[PDB]
Ligand binder design. Structure first.
Ligand SMILES: [Zn+2]
Length: 2031
RNA sequence: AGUAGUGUGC
């Protein structure tokens, strides 16, 4: 990026400097260094000459020197650069800054002065100031004339390297306040106050009394003093803040020492995990569980592991519906024996008989299905009636009627009372997992499963996934394709998939399942069936299977019993009562399952594939809560047990509680138990990779991947990365929303009331010194607040200004999202009236639904609560957008500034109320959400937001960093430590290491000195705080508001009052919880809920110290940061004692914490400091009121846990798996494209977090599978659109119609779904383009499109383009989307929806809205900027029936079934499809394909229509421009192993609602005026201004009068398509893990491309031309130049690196003339360099050719006193093209380029004795700049570099190679606790030249070739063998020159030239033996043939296989020559 | 029967 020379000198100046005024100048010099750097590279980007601080009076003299500068008055300014074209002078003053505030100042200053001579000379002078952003990198130019000149400018600039120097300078001097004084943009500017008057009540409040009670009396007054302090009044802002700092400095200075001095007190005794410590924990766990749960040893109490019973399919019987129905009927009737429900199952088969009348079932059912398939809506009013067939009364296809005559009254009861459990109505029941005869039973269940499921399907291993994605999986990694087959083949896959396909059909049936009906559900298996019994939503089902022989059935613990029938055996499973939410997951279980297996097995050959799948079905299908209780606690139980410092005992003895209800759970528990002990013995089995560090980051970082560790869930060995996956991944198998709300509300309530009681009874004291639970070290707090509050205001002065802007404090409440959102909200008051009326309605609807059930199968309160509970404070649920509307209409909210309204609300609202609703997430331990009043939301907003922008300043806080941005931060901080550790070790041990190499004589004396030295120590505290919210003093936060400098006194009074009320805040127990406790039935022994509510009197309990979970994150997080800031100071004083160095780095995120400590020792042992660090860690937490959970907290020597994002020893790594398990049931079930959109987004996310392409593609397959399974769009399904459309396969069917996503992953990762459309257009620009222009930019290939011929194209090719233009372009672009008939639902709670009723009811008032909205069309798309505007927007919104539904929650489970059932019904309205073709009702999916073709065939494809596609898609979006370029200019290079992974940021490829108001009326309300100009162009170029008006203007003559509906609906479309153009998208933080650091776009592109090709090897990427094009106005000049630079940089270095010094000019001269780099002649590139204005870059090149003149030297010398003859003399002994002396010791620079580019050279061969330097250029292996790599290289690699034309003495011929020394890589151990070797590049000695390397290679490798090709006991001598050699090398020329043969020839050649036998080799033709007659050149193939067989061969590596293949090839080939398949008639003609 | 459960439900 930047120059290396200036970096080194600026780094040294930071250490050299001591005083702040010296450090000041280093910051000033760094600005100019960046200033010129931007200018140097931009001048080449614009092709102009570079200049610096050139006077304006001289700039005119270049244009017109006839008038002298004295008489003509020119403005005396100092511009940077100038240009004169088109009779206009353009003045340049480039500058790099974040804001244009510094640019407009210099703009108007220049514009004013330049006008003095602008009218004097009558030549207009334009000011062109170019500014670039130093982080986001965006170009900003003010000149409009300059915009039209340069359409696109190349800006791949690097500031990343500049900020590295800034970090160093603001580290040493950043602590000193003398340096902070010098950096200022106003010193300190405090903005306008948010309030006018203070708060008197705050000083009176009893909580403020209680605050000062505990506090000491000097502190009491200080708090008074601090609040009343105004920062704007006193001379400086830090008057008070420093004053209170200096008071507490007595106790602080002492307490910092106190903690630090404990380093000597410590011992080598810390909570370390050990086999016994784990064992002890388990035993106390057993005791706990055996009390807390009812332990059972009986095998009848178990629950099903899986809720399914699979049995082998029967191919002998027919696979057809009607047949199976009767088959199961007779089968069920035929059941023989006696049980409980035997005669019940018997009659059920009897009630589904058809027999003779099989054909009547085929018709009757098809009529009913056809009746429903006609209508969009369901068939209402008409009564469904059954038809008597044999004994059964069929109601629908596979639906029957329960006939009360066919079953006994007693036998009907048995089935429903006992078996189905309809009418059945104290510890939990669990299985003893410590019983070996229970663990046995559990193991035998697995042994049983493996015995049956391992057996193959025997059916074709070809399903949609493999059929359509197999190709794209296989090419990524062939292993995974096979792995997939291995699964699909095995009964495992058929078992799950048939349960999936069966459940889909169980749900589909269960929807219309009545109370007098039992339904039958069949699957792809013709033995497996299911019976769905009447449900009293709840699905009641049994799996009924007809397995072959007895016990050829899989029972996981689900089966009721097997039964013998009259033909075979039939088994019926226990009645399962599951919920649709659970069942859904079972349907998507195969996708979950495949991923599980593939992820585990991936690239690990030691694992048993049949054992992975054996475990996987029991996970992917496990829907019980038994499993979650294992999967979650395991993650910590393993990691704790393999960490260094960690408390396992306590975690296993308290936090671990198995709920082993099922039988898999028992087996899985013991898998975990065992895995805990294996960890302890593997702690030291972890190794640390050899770190190849050579300045600016490291490649080959992180942990060593060694397969020495042991797996957890199955047998085999595993890698660390894989071990971690096996540890953490299990938890993501867990299922969401399993927690029954009835139980959650109780346990959530109980906990809050338990911890509040704790505080009420036990915790009384607030502050303390000894450090105790819920206590803060008040003196230490106040100081550490003061110190940080200073540094978080000194580093940014406008801090109060930044808060106002970024959080919209000044603007009206109606603008901020958090307030105008559709989130849940709590309303307080009295609703006893409507709450009673809303309840009794449902209590009647209860009886309504019961009355109807009494007729068919006779099986069978809010008033009470209010009457019973006296002190019941009444509340209600509402919406956040609705509350705002309510508070405005009743006028308490206004257009007053939101903060100004907040301040008043803090003092107005005095009592705060909060309610909780459960999340019920995948975790077994349930999480609560506290949601209270809207009034509260406003208060917390300010307090939290003020802390937000404060927290952002501190780099330690990470809640500030949105998205997965933390991952890179982990890395950047880990790398800083790995570097520091090395740097510091080399700085101390250098004195000792010198003596070691000196003596190494006797080695017995060396060990004495090698012991007594410095010792490295790294450690990471992977923390997790205990009860961050509940067990935390809220009183401490009062001080943060008090001490605050950027808060006014009248604000400070008001903030603290609200917080004073947030102590007397009440928790409302929601009614649903109170209803559970309403019906007593004997109360709880010790009822905590009743205790706190006084035997249930009030529904409110007061919560004090427990500030509610998530309400004060940032606030608490700043105090956390302040706490860890102390921990730093503690250790940093402790390590100065021992005399060494320490680097502590703390990452803070509310409750999740990570703190990395790196120490270089001298005195005491490493293990002492380990215990010391942990002591002060808890101390640091507890001195601030927070307590650290030592249970979950673990410490490693590498690993970093932080928010579950993991960084290893530099190498960042997340659990790629967790995101692949999302693409299964994560969608809103809207449409085929709409579903896939989010399912592929989940796959895109995996790639970010370092996922292999092979597995990435799997998710893409699964996603498609589920997507197509939802709407019956799979191959062979109903809506299968391959026959309906013209196409070969689903790759060619548009993804809008649902097909497959045919694109490269490197595109899908970037854009996705749209990629599939983009690839179909790039395919064309690689088919329908000529030989010229195709190799050039994409832009050029788009110009040729309008010169194509339409007739050339094919049916499919035409088909895409027609939809792509007439449909896709304008309409998340979908065409097919099913519409529903859903109802609005109950919207009574809403106030705002009532005001729509009143405006709809009263006549005229409706139209009045729409007529008002037409004069303000800004309020159709965006919400109002003012009260009325926002309010009336809310009412209009209700117009949409979709927005009315949006505020109601539909179950995705129910939504899923509704898209299956409504697929054969008319759902897609064609009206909205045909409208576009023209500019009936709903249409069925099948008909939608037909009716699309009837319209499509009519449309016309032109040479223009196609050119609109290539404009609107490619040429419009600068991103799509580059993506297409990257895939056309792509040149994939060297395949390499993924050694070093690094984090990389996604690059850039680039007023809202107020602008649209200035479009409605052209007058705005200055910068916003300029924004409308480009908006005018957008609407005029597309011409959508007229197109919209014409569409309305001709509709009023179509309809008749004035339709207000069309007046708006068409006007809204016009404003919504504006929104996307006007309101710009925020470039959110996206981090991709790549094989190296991506600085700029091009770098990112190359590394991204190469990461998503193969799994085993990543590839480095090249490009012919620049890929970064900006549009279709910008059509090469800037793409050419850089090629010339690359070329000559490459050549000069290749020449001075490898070619002999003596003959380097000749080489260059030969290369320049007859050669070409990247299809451009090197001469033309040289001419481009010579005609350029940066010749100073290529001084040594120009001198060597004789194209260097004095002007260049004079310029070069002026950039950073010379003569030509001086150079001519000086460089008489320096022979290099990359370097010439331009002084006494100053050499010239050529700037080295990478050597992976030399392949892009194409010229005639240059032969040098024997070597062909062209082939050395074209070589891959022999281009490394490492001596050892080339010395220890293969002869196969070198054998390409030989021609020799009969040379001699190989030693002589190698004279044309560099006899200059090469660079070797040396490595050394670092002497850390995690001991690793650093490897770096040295310069070797002298005898390490390129020649000697080649020679040593030749010698070593030829010796091995000789002994392999002896074929006798002689050698490479003895003509008896030379004859054999001649024979073997003869055939090689008379056969076929493939690739294997030629190598042998050239190797033999080499070997014979070496031995001095190259005076005959060239005169070696076929011997006399083989040649019958010498003259008559006849060949005896038979002889030759038998000669090849008669060759013995050798088995020495590496030639053993080489020779073997050669022989076979040559034999086969020879035999081929003979074998000529002649025509049968041919010979019959000749003779 | 199942699902939930050292909080009494479906
Ligand atoms: Zn030769």
């Amino acid at each position: 990026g930047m120059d290396y020379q200036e970096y080194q000198q600026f780094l040294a100046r930071i250490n050299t400097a001591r005083d702040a005024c010296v450090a000041k100048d280093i910051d000033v010099d760094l600005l100019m260094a960046r200033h010129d750097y931007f200018g140097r590279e931009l001048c080449k980007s614009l092709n102009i000459e570079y200049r610096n601080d050139v006077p304006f009076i001289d700039i005119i003299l270049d244009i017109r020197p006839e008038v002298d500068p004295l008489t003509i008055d020119a403005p005396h300014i100092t511009p940077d650069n100038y240009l004169y074209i088109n009779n206009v002078l353009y003045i340049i003053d480039y500058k790099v800054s974040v804001s244009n505030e510094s640019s407009v100042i210099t703009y108007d200053k220049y514009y004013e002065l330049t006008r003095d001579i602008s009218d004097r000379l009558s030549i207009p002078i334009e000011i062109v100031i170019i500014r670039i952003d130093p982080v986001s990198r965006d170009l900003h130019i003010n000149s409009d004339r300059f915009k039209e000149l340069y359409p696109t400018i190349v800006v791949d600039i690097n500031f990343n390297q500049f900020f590295d120097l800034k970090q160093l300078l603001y580290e040493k001097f950043g602590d000193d306040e003398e340096f902070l004084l010098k950096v200022a943009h106003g010193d300190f500017t405090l903005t306008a106050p948010w309030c006018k008057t203070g708060c008197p009540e705050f000083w009176k409040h009893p909580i403020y009394k209680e605050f000062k009670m505990s506090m000491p009396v000097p502190e009491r007054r200080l708090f008074e003093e601090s609040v009343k302090f105004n920062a704007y009044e006193s001379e400086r802002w830090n008057t008070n803040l420093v004053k209170i700092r200096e008071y507490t400095k007595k106790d602080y200075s002492e307490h910092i020492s106190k903690s630090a001095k404990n380093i000597f007190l410590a011992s080598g005794f810390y909570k370390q995990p050990n086999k016994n410590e784990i064992s002890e924990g388990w035993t106390l766990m057993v005791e706990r569980v055996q009390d807390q749960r009812e332990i059972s040893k009986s095998l009848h109490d178990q629950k099903p592991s899986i809720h399914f019973i699979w049995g082998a399919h029967n191919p002998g019987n027919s696979n057809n519906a009607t047949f199976k129905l009767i088959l199961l009927s007779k089968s069920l009737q035929s059941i023989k024996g006696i049980s409980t429900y035997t005669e019940a199952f018997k009659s059920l088969g009897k009630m589904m008989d058809i027999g003779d009348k099989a054909i009547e079932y085929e018709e009757f059912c098809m009529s009913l299905k056809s009746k429903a398939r006609s209508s969009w809506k369901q068939i209402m009013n008409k009564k469904l009636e059954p038809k008597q067939i044999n004994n059964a009364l069929v109601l629908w296809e596979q639906q029957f009627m329960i006939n009360n005559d066919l079953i006994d009254k007693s036998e009907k009861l048995k089935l429903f009372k006992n078996f189905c459990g309809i009418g059945k109505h104290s510890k939990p029941k669990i299985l003893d997992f410590d019983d070996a005869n229970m663990y046995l039973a559990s193991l035998t269940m697995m042994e049983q499963s493996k015995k049956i499921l391992s057996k193959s399907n025997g059916l074709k291993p070809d399903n949609f996934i493999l059929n359509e994605f197999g190709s794209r999986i296989k090419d990524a990694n062939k292993e995974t394709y096979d792995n997939m087959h291995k699964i699909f083949e095995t009964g495992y896959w058929q078992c799950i998939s048939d349960f999936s396909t069966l459940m889909k059909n169980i749900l589909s049936v269960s929807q219309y399942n009545r109370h007098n009906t039992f339904r039958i559900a069949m699957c792809a298996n013709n033995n497996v069936f299911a019976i769905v019994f009447p449900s009293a939503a709840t699905v009641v089902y049994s799996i009924i299977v007809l397995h072959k022989e007895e016990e050829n059935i899989f029972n996981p613990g689900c089966l009721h019993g097997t039964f013998k029938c009259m033909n075979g055996y039939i088994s019926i499973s226990r009645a399962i009562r599951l919920d649709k939410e659970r069942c859904q997951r079972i349907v998507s279980s195969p996708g979950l399952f495949l991923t599980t297996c593939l992820l585990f097995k991936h690239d690990n050959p030691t694992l048993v594939m049949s054992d992975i799948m054996n475990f996987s079905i029991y996970t992917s299908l496990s829907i019980t809560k038994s499993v979650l209780s294992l999967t979650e606690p395991a993650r910590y139980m393993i990691m704790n047990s393999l960490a260094i410092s960690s408390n396992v005992k306590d975690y296993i003895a308290e936090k671990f509680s198995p709920y082993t209800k099922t039988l898999f759970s028992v087996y899985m528990t013991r898998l975990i138990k065992n895995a805990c002990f294996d960890a302890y013995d593997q702690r030291q089995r972890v190794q640390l990779r050899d770190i190849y560090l050579s300045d600016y980051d490291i490649t080959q970082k992180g942990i060593k991947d060694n397969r020495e560790l042991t797996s957890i869930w199955f047998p085999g060995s595993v890698t660390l990365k894989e071990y971690l996956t096996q540890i953490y991944l299990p938890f993501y198998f867990n299922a969401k929303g399993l927690h029954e709300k009835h139980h959650v509300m109780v346990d959530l309530a109980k906990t809050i009331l338990e911890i509040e009681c704790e505080q009420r009874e036990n915790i009384k004291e607030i502050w303390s010194t000894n450090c105790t639970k819920q206590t803060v070290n008040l003196k230490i707090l106040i100081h550490s607040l003061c110190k940080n509050l200073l540094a978080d205001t000194s580093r940014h002065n406008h801090l109060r200004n930044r808060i106002e802007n970024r959080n919209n404090f000044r603007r009206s409440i109606t603008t901020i999202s958090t307030f105008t959102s559709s989130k849940s909200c709590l309303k307080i008051g009295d609703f006893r009236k409507e709450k009673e009326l809303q309840s009794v309605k449902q209590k009647k609807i209860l009886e309504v639904q019961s009355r109807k059930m009494r007729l068919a199968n006779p099986m069978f309160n809010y008033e009470m609560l209010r009457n019973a509970m006296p002190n019941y404070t009444d509340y209600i649920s509402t919406k956040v957008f609705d509350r705002l509307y309510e508070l405005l209409d009743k006028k308490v909210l206004t257009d007053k500034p939101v903060i100004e309204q907040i301040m008043d609300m803090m003092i107005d609202h005095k009592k705060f109320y909060f309610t909780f609703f459960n999340k019920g997430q995948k975790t077994s331990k349930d999480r609560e959400i506290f949601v209270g009043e809207y009034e509260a939301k406003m208060c917390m907003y300010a307090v939290e937001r003020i802390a937000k922008e404060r927290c952002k300043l501190n780099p330690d806080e990470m809640i500030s960093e949105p998205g997965d941005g933390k991952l890179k931060v982990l890395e950047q901080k880990s790398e800083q430590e790995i570097r520091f550790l090395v740097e510091t070790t080399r700085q101390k041990n250098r004195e000792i290491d010198e003596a070691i190499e000196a003596l190494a004589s006797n080695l017995g004396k060396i060990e004495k000195l090698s012991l007594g030295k410095a010792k490295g120590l790294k450690m990471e505290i992977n923390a997790d705080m205990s009860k961050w919210s509940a067990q935390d003093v809220f009183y401490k936060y009062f001080w943060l508001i008090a001490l605050d400098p950027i808060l006014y006194p009248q604000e400070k009074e008001r903030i603290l009052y609200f917080m004073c009320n947030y102590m007397d805040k009440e928790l409302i127990l929601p009614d649903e919880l109170l209803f559970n406790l309403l019906d007593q039935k004997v109360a709880y022994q010790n009822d905590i809920i009743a205790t706190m509510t006084n035997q249930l009197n009030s529904n409110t309990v007061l919560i004090k110290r427990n500030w509610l979970q998530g309400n004060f994150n940032y606030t608490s997080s700043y105090v956390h940061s302040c706490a860890m800031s102390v921990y730093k100071e503690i250790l940093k004083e402790a390590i100065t004692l021992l005399d060494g160095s320490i680097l502590v780095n703390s990452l803070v995120h509310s409750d999740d914490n990570q703190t990395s400590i790196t120490i270089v020792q001298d005195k005491m042992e490493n293990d002492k400091i380990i215990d010391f660090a942990m002591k002060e860690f808890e101390r640091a937490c507890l001195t601030f009121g927070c307590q650290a959970n030592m249970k979950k907290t673990y410490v490693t020597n590498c690993i970093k846990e932080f928010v579950s994002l993991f960084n290893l020893y530099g190498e960042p790594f997340s659990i790629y798996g967790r995101f692949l398990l999302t693409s299964v049931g994560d969608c809103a079930y809207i449409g085929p494209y709409e579903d896939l959109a989010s399912r592929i987004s989940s796959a895109q996310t995996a790639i970010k977090h370092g996922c292999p392409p092979s597995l990435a593609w799997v998710s893409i397959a699964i996603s498609h599978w589920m997507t197509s399974l939802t709407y019956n769009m799979l191959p062979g399904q109903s809506n299968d659109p391959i026959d309906y459309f013209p196409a070969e396969n689903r790759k060619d069917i548009p993804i809008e119609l649902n097909g497959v996503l045919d694109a490269p992953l490197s595109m899908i990762s970037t854009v996705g779904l749209e990629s599939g459309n983009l690839y179909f257009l790039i395919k064309l620009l690689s088919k329908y383009t000529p030989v010229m222009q195709k190799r050039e930019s994409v832009v050029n290939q788009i110009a040729e499109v309008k010169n194509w011929k339409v007739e050339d194209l094919t049916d499919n090719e035409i088909f895409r383009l027609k939809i792509l233009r007439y449909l896709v372009l304008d309409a998340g672009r979908s065409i097919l989307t099913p519409r529903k008939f859903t109802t609005a639902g109950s919207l009574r709670k809403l106030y705002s929806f009532s005001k729509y009723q009143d405006r709809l009811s009263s006549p005229g008032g409706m139209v009045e809205l729409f007529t008002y909205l037409l004069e303000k069309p800004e309020l159709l798309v965006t919400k109002g900027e003012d009260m009325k505007d926002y309010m009336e927007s809310v009412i209009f919104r209700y117009n949409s029936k979709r927005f009315k539904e949006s505020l109601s929650i539909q179950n995705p489970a129910q939504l899923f079934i509704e898209q299956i059932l409504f697929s054969h019904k008319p759902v897609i309205d064609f009206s909205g499809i045909r409208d576009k073709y023209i500019n009936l009702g709903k249409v069925t999916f099948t008909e939608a394909y037909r009716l699309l073709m009837r319209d499509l065939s009519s449309l016309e494809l032109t040479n223009d229509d196609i050119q609109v596609i290539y404009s609107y898609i490619i040429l419009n979006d600068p991103m799509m421009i580059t993506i297409a370029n990257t895939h056309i200019l792509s040149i994939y290079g060297s395949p390499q192993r993924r050694m070093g992974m690094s984090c990389s940021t996604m690059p850039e490829f680039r007023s809202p609602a107020l602008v649209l108001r200035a479009y409605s009326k052209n007058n705005p309300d200055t910068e916003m005026a300029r924004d409308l100009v480009h908006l005018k162009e957008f609407v005029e170029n597309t011409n959508l201004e007229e197109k919209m008006k014409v569409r309305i203007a001709m509709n009023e003559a179509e309809k008749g009068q004035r339709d207000i509906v069309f007046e708006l609906k068409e006007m809204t479309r016009f404003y919504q398509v504006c929104y996307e153009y006007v309101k710009s998208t925020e470039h959110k933080i996206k981090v991709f893990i790549l094989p190296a650091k991506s600085y700029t776009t091009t770098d990112f592109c190359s590394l991204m491309q190469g990461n998503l090709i193969k799994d085993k090897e990543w590839y480095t990427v090249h490009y012919l031309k620049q890929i970064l094009s900006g549009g279709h106005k910008a059509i090469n000049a800037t793409s050419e130049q850089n090629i010339a630079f690359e070329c000559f940089k490459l050549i000069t270095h290749f020449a001075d690196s490898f070619i002999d010094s003596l003959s380097r000019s000749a080489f260059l001269q030969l290369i320049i003339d007859e050669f070409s780099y990247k299809d451009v002649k090197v001469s033309k590139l040289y001419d481009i360099i010579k005609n350029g204005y940066n010749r100073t870059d290529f001084i040594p090149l120009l001198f060597r050719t004789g194209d260097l003149r004095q002007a260049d030297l004079d310029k070069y010398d002026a950039m950073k006193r010379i003569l030509i003859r001086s150079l001519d003399y000086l460089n008489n002994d320096i022979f290099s093209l990359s370097r010439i002396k331009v002084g006494l010791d100053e050499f010239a620079t050529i700037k080295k380029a990478h050597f992976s580019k030399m392949v892009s050279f194409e010229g005639p061969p240059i032969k040098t004795g024997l070597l062909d330097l062209t082939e050395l250029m074209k070589s891959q292996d022999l281009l490394n700049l490492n001596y050892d790599n080339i010395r220890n290289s293969n002869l196969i690699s070198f054998s390409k570099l030989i021609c020799c034309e009969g040379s001699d003495n190989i030693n002589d011929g190698l004279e044309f190679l560099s006899d200059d020394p090469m660079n070797f890589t040396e490595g050394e151990a670092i002497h850390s606790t995690p001991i690793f070797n650093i490897y770096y590049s040295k310069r070797g000695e002298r005898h390490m030249t390129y020649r000697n390397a080649i020679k040593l290679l030749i010698e070593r490798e030829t010796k091995i070739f000789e002994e392999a090709f002896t074929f006798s006991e002689n050698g490479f001598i003895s003509p008896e063998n030379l004859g054999c050699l001649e024979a073997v090398v003869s055939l090689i020329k008379l056969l076929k020159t493939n690739e294997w043969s030629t190598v042998i020839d050239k190797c033999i050649h080499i070997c014979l030239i070496k031995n001095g036998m190259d005076h005959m080799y060239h005169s070696f033709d076929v011997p006399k033996c083989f040649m019958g007659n010498p003259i008559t050149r006849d060949i005896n193939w038979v002889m030759f043939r038998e000669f090849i067989n008669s060759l013995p061969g050798t088995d020495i590596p590496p030639w053993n296989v080489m020779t073997e293949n050669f022989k076979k090839k040559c034999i086969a080939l020879i035999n081929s020559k003979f074998e000529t398949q002649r025509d049968f008639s041919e010979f019959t003609k000749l003779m």
